[PDB]
Amino acid sequence: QWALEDFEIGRPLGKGKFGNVYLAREKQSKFILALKVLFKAQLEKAGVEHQLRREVEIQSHLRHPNILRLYGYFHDATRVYLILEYAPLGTVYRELQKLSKFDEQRTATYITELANALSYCHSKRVIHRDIKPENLLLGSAGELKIADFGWSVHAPSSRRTTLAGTLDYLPPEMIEGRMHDEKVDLWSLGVLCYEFLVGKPPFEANTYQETYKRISRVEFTFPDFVTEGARDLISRLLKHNPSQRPMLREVLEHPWITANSSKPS
Numbered sequence: 001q002w003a004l005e006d007f008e009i010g011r012p013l014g015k016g017k018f019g020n021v022y023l024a025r026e027k028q029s030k031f032i033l034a035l036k037v038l039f040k041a042q043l044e045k046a047g048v049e050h051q052l053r054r055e056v057e058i059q060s061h062l063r064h065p066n067i068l069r070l071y072g073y074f075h076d077a078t079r080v081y082l083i084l085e086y087a088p089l090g091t092v093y094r095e096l097q098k099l100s101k102f103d104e105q106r107t108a109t110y111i112t113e114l115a116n117a118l119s120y121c122h123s124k125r126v127i128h129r130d131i132k133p134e135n136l137l138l139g140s141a142g143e144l145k146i147a148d149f150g151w152s153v154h155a156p157s158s159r160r161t162t163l164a165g166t167l168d169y170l171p172p173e174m175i176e177g178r179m180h181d182e183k184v185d186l187w188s189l190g191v192l193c194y195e196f197l198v199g200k201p202p203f204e205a206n207t208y209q210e211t212y213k214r215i216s217r218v219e220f221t222f223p224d225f226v227t228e229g230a231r232d233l234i235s236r237l238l239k240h241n242p243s244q245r246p247m248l249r250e251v252l253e254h255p256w257i258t259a260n261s262s263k264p265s
């Protein structure tokens with residue numbers, strides 16, 4: 001159906017481990033979108049074709065205003081192209097580097113939008129497993145949108161793929177290679193809430209080995225400026241035991257969230 005000849009390519013939007021993402025316009029309709037380019041050699045070398053099909057299958061069937069749309073795909077001799085919704089305001093990662101820290105209103109609003117999107121995903125027993133600032137995009141009205149579903153699966157699950165980069169957003173059960181479920185996304189939600197308010201993730205360290213130690217032992221402390229309500233929510237989400245992490249509705253109706261969020265459940 002679709003081919004490369006159907007698009008005019010624009011400026012690079014960003015780069016990932018496998019993905020090179022470009023702004024693009026469909027020639028006949030003038031529709032502006034994002035084109036995620038992956039190299040097949042690369043894909044075969046790492047043996048992650050199953051991850052890419054899951055990304056296409058899962059994300060194309062999800063429909064939610066806080067989740068990035070995937071319209072379709074095509075491939076040629078050397079590359080695979082994912083046709084994505086274009087997010088014009090960029091990543092949360094870039095916004096964080098710009099402002100150093102977010103205030104409580106901005107943070108609570110982002111968390112509400114995240115929890116809404118995750119609640120939708122978990123209703124289909126879909127777990128994202130890779131929630132972090134680089135994978136959170138921003139729409140034209142500044143609304144948060146979850147993207148990059150390459151690591152998503154159906155719960156329950158194990159891990160048959162090698163962990164690539166940072167451990168900073170993964171729960172103990174995940175880094176220890178144990179079986180896991182939906183509660184992994186709630187651990188990540190706690191890590192994000194901390195990083196939004198403080199400017200860095202709670203278990204950050206100089207080495208892989210040291211980061212692993214802090215996560216498994218849940219070693220983190222708060223700066224003085226972090227308020228009581230924020231500390232309560234974060235402490236509840238960062239529990240070593242997955243079953244003691246709250247449900248997403250508990251997050252959405254948490255007193256600190258309701259008092260500071262500008263968006264509803």
Ligand SMILES: Nc1ncnc2c1ncn2[C@@H]1O[C@H](COP(=O)(O)OP(=O)(O)O)[C@@H](O)[C@H]1O
Pocket residue numbers: 013014015016017018019020021034036068084085086087088090091134135137147148150
């Ligand atoms: N739809 C989009 N709109 C704008 N920028 C995007 C979009 N998709 C990806 N990007 C940019 O490209 C980067 C990599 O995209 P991603 O799909 O996460 O690649 P990978 O799966 O290799 O991590 C993102 O961090 C983001 O900066």
Ligand SMILES: COC(=O)c1sc(-c2cccs2)cc1N
Pocket residue numbers: 040041043044049052053056073075080
């Ligand atoms: C060497 O080829 C590959 O790795 C791949 S991955 C892929 C697809 C992934 C998701 C939808 S289609 C097609 C080919 N041909």
Ligand SMILES: [Cl-]
Pocket residue numbers: 157158159160
């Ligand atoms: Cl498995």
Ligand SMILES: [Cl-]
Pocket residue numbers: 158159160161
């Ligand atoms: Cl896996």
Ligand SMILES: [Cl-]
Pocket residue numbers: 119247248249250
């Ligand atoms: Cl819930």
Ligand SMILES: [Mg+2]
Pocket residue numbers: 016134135148
């Ligand atoms: Mg990514």
Ligand SMILES: [Mg+2]
Pocket residue numbers: 016018148149150151
């Ligand atoms: Mg990916």
